[PDB]
Every structure is written in structure tokens, then in C-alpha cells.
């Protein structure tokens, strides 16, 4: 974990760099967004497991349950967008200028 918690953390930052620099398809962000939730879920589960802190295992899952719906909302917005613009491409999302 000393260096196994640095890989996961950098994974979250590499996923951070991803969600923040868009490119074309919006799905790739959402998908990326999810890459973080996995990294957070893995790190939370890892430390809870090596702290033998069983009282906290509820959290690793609450994180996933909330993250799943969060993503559900995200995809419905995505479907709504390629119903209004025929694509998920972000450039289209420039009307509010």
C-alpha cells in the first residue's frame, strides 16, 4: 500500500486529467469519470481491508451505489444530447455562449 496506494492515486489523477480535457465524444468523459470511481472504490476497500476496519466496509459499496445512479443520470443526459444533435460530440454543446 505505501506504493500500491500511489499507483491507485495517480490512476485517479490520470483519470482526473482525462475528465478535464475533453475531446469529441462525451461518452469518453463519462467513461473516464467512472475510472475514478473504480480507483476510489479500490483505494477505500484497500485501506479499510488493511486497517481491519470492518465498520467501514459499508462505505466502499455506498460509494458504488451512489456512483452508479450518478452515472445513470449522466448517460440519460448523453442519450438526450444525441437525440437533439445526433451525436454526443461536445462541440455541439455551445449554445449557451
Amino acid at each position: 500500500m505505501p506504493s500500491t496506494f500511489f499507483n491507485l492515486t495517480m490512476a485517479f489523477s490520470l483519470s482526473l486529467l482525462g475528465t478535464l480535457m475533453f475531446r469529441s465524444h462525451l461518452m469518453s468523459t463519462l467513461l473516464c469519470l467512472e475510472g475514478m470511481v473504480l480507483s476510489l472504490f479500490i483505494m477505500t476497500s484497500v485501506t479499510s481491508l488493511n486497517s481491519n476496519s470492518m465498520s467501514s466496509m459499508p462505505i466502499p459499496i455506498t460509494i458504488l451505489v451512489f456512483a452508479a445512479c450518478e452515472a445513470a443520470v449522466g448517460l440519460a443526459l448523453l442519450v438526450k444530447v444525441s437525440n437533439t444533435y445526433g451525436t454526443d460530440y461536445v462541440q455541439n454543446l455551445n449554445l449557451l455562449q
Binding site: 505505501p2 486497517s51 481491519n52 476496519s53 470492518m54 465498520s55 467501514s56 459499508p58
Partner: protein, 103 residues
Amino acid sequence: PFLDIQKKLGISLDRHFMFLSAEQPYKNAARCHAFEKEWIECAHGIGGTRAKKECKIEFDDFEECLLRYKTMRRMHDIKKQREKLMKEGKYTPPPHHSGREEP
């Protein structure tokens, strides 16, 4: 917290499980339960501003039960020398490493 509707109502839906020394299921004590207690019964009645200087012995220890980095260091240091010493042929693992086995 910002609106303590919990203390007022007496309910404790969010406090019972905030620290490693809270009730663990089947009373399987956590790790560092020897310290967090010692570091929160110390900082009880003494506010943070003064839970941060005088109750530093118990956090410096609890910062080491969990992180357990000084150990890692000492150990890592030990190995290095053992590596160098083993280079000179000075250190030869004892058969104790492969001795009898205590029940």
C-alpha cells in the same frame, strides 16, 4: 455539525462509526485501536487548538501504528546493510531461518 439535528433528536445514525475504535462487528478489534483511544480520550474537553500541540505524543504514535512508516524505514535500512554486508560475505543467514518449528 452545521445543523445538529442528530444530537437534538438524540439519534446517532452517523456517529457510531467514524473512527477505527468504534464498535467493530463481532468485536473484532481494529488495528491501532490501542492508540486512537489514547488519542481521543486525551483530546476530549480540550479543543483542537490544544489537541494539536500537547496531545502530539498520541498522534505521533497513532500516525505510526497505522502508516507504520518508521518501521518500514528501520526495516528497509536494516536490509540495506544486510545487503552490503552480505556482499562482503559477512552475513550468512542462520539456520534459525530454517529451524524447528514451534507448535
